Design a protein around this ligand. Structure first.
Ligand SMILES: [Cl-]
Ligand SMILES: [Cl-]
Ligand code: NA
Ligand code: NA
Length: 192
């Protein structure tokens, strides 16, 4: 069938420097996410609504609660722990009027633009490995939730390689961006 088994991160703990890069990437990615939502006509609203494209998280990062910030930090932190677990080394060495009307918070996100930077084929491969691991993490938790509630199904409870590209996009894009951001910030990743 499908038995999701995320990478075993036993013993791996992030030091202050890697916690800092998780923090900085999460602020960066939030701004990237918000820039993309705003460009696609979303606006801030108190309750999330797919129908009318209103999103409570469309605020400056410093206005987010810890739950909202951890939506960025948790996957990123786990992908970094997974990299280390499998033996990788991480060496630290005008305002548009319509866009500003997206929120009442005078918020015009201007993240650093990573589309300028390229990833090696090897790092693209790694981003797919990290994206698969994020899927397996979600899938293991989802199966647990269904089981404790007496059973059930979910259409995405399938191996990563059976997902469509659109189903993979959220995790693939986060991991590609994270690896570019590591590059941008002067980190070198060394294969086992
Ligand atoms: Cl913070
Ligand atoms: Cl879910
Ligand atoms: Na172990
Ligand atoms: Na990739």
């Amino acid at each position: 069938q499908y038995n999701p088994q995320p990478i075993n991160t036993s013993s791996v703990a992030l030091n202050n420097d890697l916690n800092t890069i998780v923090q900085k990437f999460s602020e960066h990615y939030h701004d990237a996410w918000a820039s993309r939502k705003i460009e696609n006509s979303w606006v801030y609203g108190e309750n999330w609504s797919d129908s009318q494209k209103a999103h409570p998280r469309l605020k400056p990062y410093n206005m987010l609660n810890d739950y909202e910030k951890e939506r960025y930090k948790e996957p990123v932190r786990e992908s970094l722990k997974a990299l280390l677990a499998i033996g990788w080394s991480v060496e630290h060495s005008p305002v548009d009027v319509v866009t500003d009307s997206a929120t009442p918070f005078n918020y015009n996100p201007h993240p650093v633009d990573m589309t300028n930077l390229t990833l090696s084929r090897e790092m693209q491969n790694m981003a797919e490995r990290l994206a698969e691991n994020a899927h397996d993490i979600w899938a293991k938790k989802k199966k647990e939730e269904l089981t404790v509630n007496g059973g059930g199904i979910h259409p995405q409870l399938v191996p990563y390689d059976l997902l469509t590209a659109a189903e993979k996009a959220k995790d693939r894009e986060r991991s590609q961006e994270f690896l570019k951001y590591l590059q941008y910030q002067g980190y070198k990743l060394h294969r086992p």
